[PDB]
Design a protein around this ligand. Structure first.
Ligand SMILES: NC(=O)c1ccc[n+]([C@@H]2O[C@H](COP(=O)([O-])OP(=O)(O)OC[C@H]3O[C@@H](n4cnc5c(N)ncnc54)[C@H](OP(=O)(O)O)[C@@H]3O)[C@@H](O)[C@H]2O)c1
Ligand code: SF4
Ligand code: SF4
Ligand SMILES: [Zn+2]
Lengths: 385, 208, 176, 306, 111, 71, 114, 123
């Protein structure tokens, strides 16, 4: 049998993920991919840093999420430190935490529609995506990778503006999602390109430990978005999509309705924000203000020491996970009792979502296999967990 | 006490004190310590003789579904006289409850793996072999994932230093990309950060 | 809650099949839809002519390093080493010394612009507000041997401009 | 003064200067000099792109590039004013359409037998050839021995090195064979009389320099390069077609980089196994390389498997 | 209905007696275990609690209430595996006491 | 020894120096006991610090302030 | 030792296993040397195979040798197939590395006693 | 079960390259950085290996180096498992001893005497 390794080929998509194919003439029936192109030494590296200093290495763990990562870290730290965050701060973590889902669910369709080979829905949506990075630069520090969420809540307040901008932005977005509905849904060939492909629906679709979509849209109703709270996140109203059967085209149609939920939540979140503060007030965790660290005596000693070493975290293990826009996000943060943490093991999606490519692939073509991968939305560097 | 302090609750602290109690009652063969976390988490310390059946007991029931294997990790602890610490984490689907399984071991003593019990441990179980050398029993395919092909280190333990020994370089001496002993441009200046005076009263050690 | 999408049984009668028969046979689909949504070509191309035109920014945008000083030159840096201890890449290296006047200053001052991961914490750690991430992306030399900035780049680079820097701090220091 | 391991990013004390260093010989020598770590100062003639493949041997700050002609003086003086040792390997084959080609082996080794020597250098080493004799053969082979004596007046102690014919990867003499895909493969010249010379292997060449660069006491005591075992046969030409189974030129092509039906064809068929009283290679040890093991590498033709 | 919600199963076929066999299928195997472990004390407790509400009342939809599983065909799977659970309770012996106590200082966290 | 790495590289060097530029300042005077130094402007520059000026009429540039302060 | 072994019991299921895969390496050394298109002599490969087995012969305890068996067998998984693209097999030979001195007078002129 | 009780001193090897026999470890107590007086940084045994050469990197003056270990400190619990870790991987070492001070006898009130010498002034 021919043993071609169609992978390292820089054939668009993402020139990585080099695997083997022991194809039985035309059908595959055996797929054993290799990973480890970026191992980077991540989990060993954090063992020498402090809590505030290690924080951007959670940010660079995806390619896409900037505020959904570091959402799974501060909320994994504030439980250890007996802190609730202040109420103005929680309305921003839901706002940017429900704006990164309008970055994955744009990239999760176009990049899938580029491996397939369509050109024009790649350029028709990233030109609208530019209207959104101006937000990131205006609020935090940079284009994408922002050390913005801290353990002491939000870093700083978003400036004057950004409320007649987001309302200006979000009132003209549903026309753009009505474009791709005409581009892909009512079309037949793309429907014929993906129906009854990847029919994985049994209880081994959950014994493989999958997280969401490539879950509930295939069947079993469950999510971490209204059975487990984060912040002020249950006080808004929305629904969660479910597809019919257990193929890719009934996990594709989650993502059209999923983007039709984030517009509602943003248009529901803006009406409910109170004026208030930014940081936690007790200042053993938050740094004091700049106009304060130049006047009093108490401000500097709880400033100058708070950057030489970090916080004082109590011992005892902990664990949590939140909704990453492609899955769960496990962090088993072992604390020791000093400024420097102990072991920090992460669970990212793709461990389950790509080990189950063995079950999902066989009985099918070779041209099916590239169409499988862009449905799970697998990003490397994120499989470094 | 005030705002900006996490409001704890007692309802989940009650049932998780209730549920895990009669778990040791109905298998006093493998369970050696159960503890309740002060924020609604549970540990069931298990000697690894019962690595398969206790999972197999939590694999199915009518009062405990627990069929969502989320997290297999591995934590080393030197100065314990049995170093390593395999820790699971599993999820009840119908009940919204988290519980972990802490099973210690040592290096050379193997562990009966969870291959028939769960099929999400296909790539997780191999990782501990590549990173520590904990040889699980009866796995159908033990291989090398997430490391390079020529390492002999099992790096995630503590004696392996920060850099390796294998700083790689190219020469045009013939064609090859050859290995070499490691050479840095900078020390990685190691600080000293542990302030004295014991900020924590509750976790005070036995004073001997 | 729920929603059952792509869950709809067909019509299956005499007349509505003629809407599904004219679709496949004469292609009233795929042209009314997909030949009109492409054209849609008459819109204006939103392209920036980069060597002439430039895009928007923010007043808190990061970039090139620089050092400031007081009115008539004083070296605002006091060498209190705090930017070093929070640099995640340890791109800072400072050796200080008592200068003969008596007040302490610096001797070596380094920013590994290769290693520099741009966490910008140096800008938010100096008490006397010395180092500033200056907003100019002018870069791209030709050697690895050049981007290691010594001190006499940085004071010079902090003095190619100041009115660019001094207006952005003065419009943003009230927030932080 | 030296420090630590000389694996990479060391100091090792020495500061050399290698001219030429764009051909087959001068590149491969420096690729050892950036391994032990030193201030290698290599000035090139007229080629910014033709040294691009050279740079990833010295780590960082160890190499440096300058421009020089050679008929000018200070460009050969400004660079060499801060060093310790200096070797030279400059020269080539056939006369240029613009140059003079005689004094290039006479005044150009003299142009760096200038104030260069007076500046305070030591262990200056030039290259020779085993067959460069004062006899009336050839136009290129002789007029190399003229530089062996008329420039030997300057630098009274040098240890000028004398190599035999070399074989490596991309030389001219061994690649003169098997580049002869033609309507007839003739040897030189249909006779097995004098073939062959001593093909020393290229690792032995670069190993002889680095032992001599702090030997010590190797100045004046000139050295010769032993070849393989032992003389060689006519079988070499048959050895080519048996196992082979029968850089700044121009934008399209160079008009004249020929096979040169001139005194090129005789400069190799003049063997001259010279005097064995030179020490010259085994004492500058250790160099011992056969031919039968390194022949698989350089030859490359259409079969590639069998 | 023709789809059972949770995709991957089929309504196959009859409620109210496919269950009623399988509860009683367990209870006969339940008597085989030597009674010193409390495994019998709770498992026979909930099956008699279940089967009393199972046998035998209309409708299918009413049997969903007061029996907290998924749909009724999936409630089979709630006890399908439990039959496979209790028969392996004879094979290994959890009613035996503790074995291999840890060496007296191991589950102390701060090093 | 090091003088070879910049040949044809012109040695881009600083021009002004703050080694001694304090000394060209009109050294301030008050005739009081203790003075604030929020020099460079409020909420920027060096923090507030109080200096005794009784002894060879000076303060000592406060370290932080840098400007020569005296009476 | 209150610990169960991996495969062997005591030294005799062990020492027959290290002999076992030695033949699998021994027919592999001529097999790969024309496959990975590298050019040394094949006897050097057979010397380096027995080089590796003989060095670790100072063990008087089971399940460590058995631990090396799992290490020794996993080497063949990449080896029989093509998973080491012309570099990892060349990584066995410290070829372009400068020689260690290993002599007392030779160490004394270069180095602060490394 | 296959218990097969046997006895051997566990010396593991093959995982590093050569630095078993080359180096010698050191087990000691860190004892009171005496710029201040906090005694929390007692109670934990630590380790540190041999120190080798630190030269100058001739472009900046950085402390570039060989000596690949040079930074490895672990947190031990006591003297008992201090030895047992150095032998389990098996390289040479040397052990210090814990120093605890005098208790000691200090009592105010005897600083005002009738005939003694213990008498303070100028307070
Ligand atoms: N050992 C042997 O068997 C053997 C055989 C044949 C020849 N040689 C001679 O020994 C040396 C080996 O050279 P090679 O094998 O590496 O080939 P090569 O290409 O001739 O290298 C010698 C360098 O000298 C440069 N050069 C020629 N004329 C020059 C001039 N007027 N000014 C400055 N540079 C000049 C050449 O090109 P650039 O100008 O671009 O730098 C070349 O880079 C040469 O001198 C050669 O004549 C030795
Ligand atoms: S920014 Fe602050 S820490 Fe850095 S050199 Fe200046 S005064 Fe020192
Ligand atoms: S700019 Fe970034 S990398 Fe550089 S010192 Fe500041 S925080 Fe560190
Ligand atoms: Zn002042």
């Amino acid at each position: 049998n021919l043993t071609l390794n169609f992978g390292p080929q820089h054939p668009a998509a993402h020139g990585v993920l080099r695997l083997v194919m022991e194809l039985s003439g035309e059908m595959v029936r055996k797929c054993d991919p290799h990973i480890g192109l970026l191992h980077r030494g991540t989990e060993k590296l954090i063992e020498y840093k402090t809590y505030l200093q290690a924080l951007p290495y959670f940010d660079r763990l995806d390619y896409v999420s900037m505020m959904c990562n570091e959402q799974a870290y501060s909320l994994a730290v504030e439980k250890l430190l007996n802190i609730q965050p202040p109420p103005r701060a929680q309305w921003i973590r839901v706002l940017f935490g429900e704006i990164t889902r309008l970055l994955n669910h744009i990239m999760a369709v176009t990049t899938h529609a580029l491996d397939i080979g369509a050109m024009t829905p790649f350029f028709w949506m990233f030109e609208e995506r530019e209207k959104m990075f101006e937000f990131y630069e205006r609020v935090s520090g940079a284009r994408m990778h922002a050390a913005y969420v801290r353990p002491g809540g939000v870093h700083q307040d978003l400036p004057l503006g950004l409320m007649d901008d987001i309302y200006e932005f979000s009132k003209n977005f549903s026309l753009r999602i009505d474009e791709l509905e005409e581009m892909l849904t009512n079309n037949r060939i793309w429907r014929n390109r993906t129906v009854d492909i990847g029919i994985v629906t049994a209880e081994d679709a959950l014994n493989y430990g999958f997280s969401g979509v490539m879950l509930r849209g295939s069947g079993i109703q469950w999510d971490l978005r209204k059975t487990q709270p984060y912040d002020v996140y249950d006080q808004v109203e929305f629904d969660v999509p479910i597809g019919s059967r257990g193929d890719c085209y009934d996990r594709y149609l989650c993502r059209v309705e999923e983007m039709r939920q984030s517009i509602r939540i943003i248009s529901q979140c803006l009406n409910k924000m109170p004026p208030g503060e930014i940081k936690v007030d007790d200042a053993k965790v938050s740094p004091p203000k700049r106009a304060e660290m130049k006047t009093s005596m108490e401000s500097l000693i709880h400033h100058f020491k708070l950057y030489t070493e970090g916080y004082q975290v109590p011992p005892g293990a902990t664990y949590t996970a939140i909704e990453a826009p492609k899955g769960e996000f496990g962090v088993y943060l072992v604390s020791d009792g000093s400024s420097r943490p102990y072991r920090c093991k992460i669970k990212a999606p793709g461990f389950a979502h790509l080990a189950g490519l063995d079950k999902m692939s066989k009985g099918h073509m070779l041209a099916d296999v590239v169409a499988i991968i862009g449905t799970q939305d697998i990003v490397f560097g994120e499989v470094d967990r | 006490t005030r705002p900006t302090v996490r409001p704890r609750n007692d309802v989940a602290h009650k049932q998780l004190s209730a549920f895990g109690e009669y778990v040791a009652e109905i298998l006093p063969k493998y369970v050696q310590q159960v503890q309740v976390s002060c924020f609604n988490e549970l540990e069931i310390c298990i000697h690894p003789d019962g690595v398969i059946p206790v999972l197999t007991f939590l694999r199915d029931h009518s009062n405990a579904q627990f069929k969502s294997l989320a997290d297999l990790t591995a934590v080393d602890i030197p100065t314990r006289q049995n170093r390593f610490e395999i820790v699971y984490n599993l999820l009840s689907l119908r009940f919204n409850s988290r519980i972990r399984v802490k099973t210690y071991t040592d290096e050379l003593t193997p562990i009966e793996s969870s291959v028939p019990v769960y099929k999400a441990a296909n790539w997780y179980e191999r990782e501990i072999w590549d990173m520590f050398g904990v040889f699980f029993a009866n796995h159908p395919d033990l291989r090398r994932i997430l490391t390079d092909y020529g390492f002999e280190g099992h790096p995630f333990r503590k004696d392996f230093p920060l850099s390796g020994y294998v700083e790689l370089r190219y020469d045009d001496e013939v064609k090859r990309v050859v290995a070499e002993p490691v050479e840095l441009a900078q020390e990685f200046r190691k600080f000293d950060l542990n302030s004295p005076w014991e900020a924590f009263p509750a976790y005070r050690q036995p004073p001997e | 809650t729920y929603k059952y999408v792509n869950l709809r049984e067909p019509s299956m009668d005499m007349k509505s099949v003629t809407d599904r028969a004219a679709q496949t046979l004469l292609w009233t689909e795929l042209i009314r839809g997909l030949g009109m949504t492409l054209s849609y070509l008459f819109r204006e191309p939103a392209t920036i002519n980069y060597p002439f035109e430039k895009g928007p920014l923010s007043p808190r945008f990061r970039g090139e390093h620089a050092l400031r000083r007081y009115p008539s030159g004083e070296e605002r840096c006091i060498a209190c080493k705090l930017c070093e201890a929070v640099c995640p890449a340890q791109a800072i290296t400072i050796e200080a010394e008592p200068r003969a006047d008596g007040s302490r200053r610096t001797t070596r001052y380094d920013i590994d612009m290769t290693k520099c991961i741009y966490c910008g914490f140096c800008q938010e750690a100096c008490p006397v507000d010395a180092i500033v991430e200056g907003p100019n992306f002018e870069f791209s030399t030709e050697t690895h041997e050049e981007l290691l900035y010594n001190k006499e780049k940085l004071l010079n680079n902090g003095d190619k401009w100041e009115a660019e820097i001094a207006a952005n701090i003065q419009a943003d220091y009230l927030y932080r | 003064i030296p420090h630590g391991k000389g694996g990479r990013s060391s100091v090792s004390g020495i500061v050399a200067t290698v001219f030429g260093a764009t051909g087959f010989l001068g590149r491969y020598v420096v690729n050892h000099l950036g391994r032990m770590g030193s201030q290698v100062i290599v000035p090139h003639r007229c080629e910014p792109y033709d040294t691009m493949h050279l740079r990833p041997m010295g780590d960082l700050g160890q190499i440096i590039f300058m421009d020089w002609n050679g008929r000018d003086k200070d460009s050969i003086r400004r660079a060499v004013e801060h060093s310790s040792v200096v070797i030279n390997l400059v020269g080539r084959e056939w006369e240029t359409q613009n140059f003079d080609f005689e004094d290039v082996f006479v005044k150009i080794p003299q142009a760096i037998a200038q104030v260069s020597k007076e500046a305070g250098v030591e262990k200056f080493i030039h290259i020779s050839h085993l067959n460069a004799d004062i006899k009336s053969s050839s136009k290129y082979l002789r007029s190399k021995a003229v530089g062996e004596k008329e420039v030997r007046e300057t630098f009274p102690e040098a240890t000028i090195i004398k190599p035999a014919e070399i074989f490596g990867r991309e030389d001219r003499f061994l690649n003169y064979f098997a580049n002869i895909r033609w309507f007839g493969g003739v040897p030189l010249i249909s006779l097995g009389k004098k073939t062959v010379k001593q093909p020393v292997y290229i690792v032995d060449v670069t190993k002889g320099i680095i032992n001599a660069i702090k030997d010590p006491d190797a100045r004046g005591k000139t050295f010769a390069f032993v070849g393989p075992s032992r003389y060689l046969l006519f079988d070499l030409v048959q050895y080519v077609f048996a196992v082979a189974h029968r850089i700044g030129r121009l934008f399209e092509i160079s008009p004249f980089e020929p096979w040169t039906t001139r005194d090129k064809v005789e400069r190799i068929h003049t063997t001259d196994k010279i005097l064995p009283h030179l020490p010259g290679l085994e004492d500058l040890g250790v160099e011992a390389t056969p031919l039968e093991l390194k022949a698989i590498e350089v030859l490359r033709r259409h079969r590639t498997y069998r | 209905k023709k789809t059972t919600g949770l995709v991957g199963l089929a309504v196959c076929e009859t409620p109210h007696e496919r269950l009623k066999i399988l509860y009683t299928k367990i209870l006969d195997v339940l008597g085989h275990i030597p009674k010193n472990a409390a495994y019998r004390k709770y498992t026979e407790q909930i099956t008699n609690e279940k089967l009393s509400m199972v046998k035998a009342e209309p409708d299918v939809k009413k049997l969903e209430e007061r029996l907290q599983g998924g749909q009724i065909e999936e409630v089979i799977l709630q006890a399908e595996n439990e039959l496979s659970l209790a028969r392996k309770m004879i094979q290994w012996k959890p009613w035996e006491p503790l074995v291999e106590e840890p060496p007296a200082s191991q589950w102390k966290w701060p090093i | 020894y090091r003088k070879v790495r910049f040949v044809g590289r012109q040695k881009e060097v600083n021009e002004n120096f703050a080694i001694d530029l304090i000394a060209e300042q009109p050294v301030s005077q008050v005739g009081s006991r203790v003075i604030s130094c929020d020099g460079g402007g409020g909420a920027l520059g060096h923090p507030r610090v109080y200096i005794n000026l009784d002894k060879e009429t000076k303060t000592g540039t406060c370290g932080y302030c840098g400007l020569q302060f005296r009476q | 030792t209150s610990v169960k072994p991996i495969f062997s019991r005591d030294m005799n299921e062990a020492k027959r296993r290290v002999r076992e895969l030695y033949r699998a390496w021994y027919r592999e050394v001529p097999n790969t040397v024309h496959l990975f298109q590298l050019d040394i002599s094949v006897k050097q490969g057979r010397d380096k195979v027995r080089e590796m087995f003989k060095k670790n012969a100072h063990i008087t305890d089971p399940r460590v040798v058995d631990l090396l068996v799992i290490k020794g067998k996993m080497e063949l998984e990449e080896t029989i197939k093509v998973w080491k693209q012309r570099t990892h097999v060349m990584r066995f030979f410290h070829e372009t590395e400068a020689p260690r001195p290993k002599d007392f007078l030779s160490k004394f002129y270069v180095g602060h006693d490394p | 079960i296959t218990v097969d009780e046997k006895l051997d001193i566990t010396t593991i090897t093959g995982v590093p390259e050569e630095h078993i026999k080359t180096r010698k470890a050191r087990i000691f107590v860190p004892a009171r950085n005496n710029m201040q007086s906090g005694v929390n940084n007692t109670k934990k045994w630590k380790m540190e290996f041999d120190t080798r050469e630190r030269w100058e990197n001739p472009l900046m003056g950085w402390a570039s180096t060989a000596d690949p270990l040079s930074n490895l400190v672990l947190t031990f619990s006591t003297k008992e498992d201090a030895v047992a870790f150095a032998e389990k991987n098996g390289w040479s070492y040397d052990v210090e001893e814990r120093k605890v001070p005098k208790p000691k006898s200090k009592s105010y009130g005897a600083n005002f005497s009738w005939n003694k010498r213990t008498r303070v002034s100028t307070k």
